[PDB]
């Protein structure tokens, strides 16, 4: 009585794979710090050039994305996290993503910090959390995050 | 199943022939760089003087051109291309005029540059292009222009 | 043949070499040549230099940050800085508009496809659409 | 609004050249970074800026004629200009004799 | 004879359009006019 685990959108760190995907023409999504989230693409055909679109949704029959030529910078790619547009989605904006260290209350009334190794969902759309060293899956309300 | 070749409006370079045509009274059309395209004419009758009109179309029964006296300059004629108004027309504003060097893809996947020697048109108004060294006539989409 | 040029085709190879830290030479149009480099240390970002000559005790290159555009890299020609040759002493550069005459005494235009030389220094040129070689005199440099 | 009323302009930031003499505190007459001026410059950044009141004020003196005048400019948001920054407008040409 | 129908579009796409700069030249030109109303003072009434 549940739904299988949902993969998180893996950020891409290596520039080489980013450029290879771009050369293949696969769409990229760039999280700019100052001015929001944008799509990046390589122009099809012989006249190769980079294009940008702010039509920030999955392509649909009723919603076709418009692409403007832009001189995307290498430094922009390096300093800003980039995701494959096939993955990054509204489907699961989980409060505690995978590999995040979170604080959870154990049965012995002793707060411990563990890293989330697996996350899944159920019929109600809840976020079941798996923590290393324990089998029982916790809930959203029980957990807590520690920052800095 | 086509239409015969269409002549391009030959620019006139020699000032002497320009002046001779003007003395004969044949209309001239001057492409001014700064302020568009104008007509130039010699006044009929004894009171000879140059006249200008911006009634920039072929004369018609329903559209009669109005001529204003103007002191046309020799330097204007020399530095600006001039055409006979009997020739220069909207009929064919071809993207790649005659004697223009254009880049065309050959069957061996090797791009070559050739000069357009002959241009014609067909029923649909297409622009068939003849290139030196080849018999088959290319189309607008296949070709490409290289500037500077 | 001549070993004076070894242009890079894929941008992926360019990025791979940049990761290795090797300097690149990037040509321009009616403009000075450029050298490009990846900064060392914790923070990675592109750097450029307007200087071209080799580093020495009497000459040191200057590097500054710049938001280099991938369009320049993909479009313009790129070489390894260390292995670049300054000039090949030929009348006509590669990829230059030229005029010639065909086998049937017909005049035609073309661009240079290859630049070659013999052991005695005599230079032969091959044009696009012409497999045979042409003398330096037989060619004509077309005016822009 | 700013992008509409402005003019395209190259913004290059200013910074003191290392070539300054450590003892006198005044610059070398000629070096690649700065041509005698004691202040060097960074690579340019393409920018749109509004400009007003442009004046070519001429002072005639014993040393000779001299061109100096005030021009008032207004930038975009998030841009923090600094003292003795430099701008150049390729579009606009100025006659001199 | 045949009915007149709109048909398809023909305008191609253009990218990176550069501005037009008026070219400096010593040659003469002609200043393209506009013929319209003119405003003037009533100099007679000014005398009054």
């Amino acid at each position: 009585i549940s739904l299988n685990p949902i993969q998180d959108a893996k950020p891409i760190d290596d520039i080489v794979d980013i450029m290879t995907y771009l050369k293949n023409g696969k769409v990229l999504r760039v999280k700019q710090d100052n001015q929001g989230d944008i799509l990046v693409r390589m122009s099809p055909g012989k006249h190769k050039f980079t294009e940008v679109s702010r039509d920030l949704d999955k392509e649909s029959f009723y919603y076709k994305r418009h692409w403007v030529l832009y001189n995307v910078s290498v430094n922009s790619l390096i300093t800003f996290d980039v995701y494959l547009d096939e993955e990054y989605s509204e489907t699961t904006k989980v409060k505690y993503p995978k590999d995040t260290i979170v604080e959870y209350t154990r049965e012995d009334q002793e707060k411990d910090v563990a890293m989330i190794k697996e996350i899944l969902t159920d019929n109600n759309g809840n976020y079941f959390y798996a923590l290393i060293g324990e089998t029982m899956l916790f809930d959203e309300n029980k957990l807590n995050k520690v920052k800095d | 199943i086509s239409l015969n070749p269409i002549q391009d409006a030959k620019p006139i370079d020699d000032i002497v022939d320009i002046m001779t045509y003007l003395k004969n009274g044949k209309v001239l059309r001057v492409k001014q760089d700064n302020q568009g395209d104008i007509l130039v004419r010699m006044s009929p009758g004894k009171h000879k003087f140059t006249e200008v009109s911006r009634d920039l179309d072929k004369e018609s029964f329903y559209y009669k051109r109005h001529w204003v006296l103007y002191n046309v300059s020799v330097n204007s004629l020399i530095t600006f291309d001039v055409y006979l108004d009997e020739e220069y027309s909207e009929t064919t504003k071809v993207k790649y005029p005659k004697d223009t060097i254009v880049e065309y893809t050959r069957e061996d996947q090797e791009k070559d540059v050739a000069m357009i020697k002959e241009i014609l048109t067909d029923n649909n108004g297409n622009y068939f292009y003849a290139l030196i060294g080849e018999t088959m006539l290319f189309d607008e989409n296949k070709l490409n222009k290289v500037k500077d | 043949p001549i070993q004076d040029a070894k242009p890079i085709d894929d941008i992926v190879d360019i990025m791979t070499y940049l990761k290795n830290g090797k300097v690149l030479r990037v040509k321009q149009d009616n403009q000075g040549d450029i050298l490009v480099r990846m900064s060392p240390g914790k923070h990675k970002f592109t750097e450029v230099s307007r200087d071209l000559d080799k580093e020495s005790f009497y000459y040191k290159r200057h590097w500054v940050l710049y938001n280099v555009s991938v369009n320049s890299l993909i479009t313009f020609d790129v070489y390894l800085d260390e292995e670049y040759s300054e000039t090949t002493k030929v009348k006509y550069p590669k990829d230059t508009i030229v005029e010639y005459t065909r086998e049937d005494q017909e005049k035609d235009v073309a661009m240079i496809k290859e630049i070659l030389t013999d052991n005695n220094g005599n230079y032969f040129y091959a044009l696009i659409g012409e497999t045979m070689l042409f003398d330096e005199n037989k060619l004509n440099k077309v005016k822009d | 609004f700013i992008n509409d009323r402005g003019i395209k302009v190259l913004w290059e930031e200013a910074y003191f050249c290392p070539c300054l003499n450590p003892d006198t505190g005044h610059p070398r007459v000629d070096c690649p970074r700065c041509h005698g001026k004691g202040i060097a410059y960074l690579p340019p950044k393409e920018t749109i800026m509004a400009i007003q009141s442009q004046e070519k004020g001429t002072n005639q003196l014993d040393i000779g004629i001299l061109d100096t005048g005030t021009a008032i400019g207004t930038t975009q948001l998030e841009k923090r200009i600094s003292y003795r920054d430099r701008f150049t407008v390729p579009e606009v040409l100025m006659p001199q004799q | 004879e045949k009915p007149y129908m709109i048909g398809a579009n023909s305008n191609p796409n253009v990218i990176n359009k550069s501005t037009t700069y008026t070219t400096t030249t010593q040659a003469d030109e002609q200043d393209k006019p506009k013929y319209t109303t003119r405003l003037e003072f009533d100099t007679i009434d000014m005398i009054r």
Binding site: - | - | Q31, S69 | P43, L66, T68, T88 | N13, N16
Partner: peptide, 25 residues
């Protein structure tokens, strides 16, 4: 303020290989 007393050349901007007024199809 205008630059009269000391004049420096226009800055060396990095060019882009994108042709201006480029046809697309």
């Amino acid at each position: 303020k205008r630059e009269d007393v000391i004049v420096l050349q226009d800055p060396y901007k990095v060019n882009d290989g994108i042709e201006e007024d480029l046809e697309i199809q």
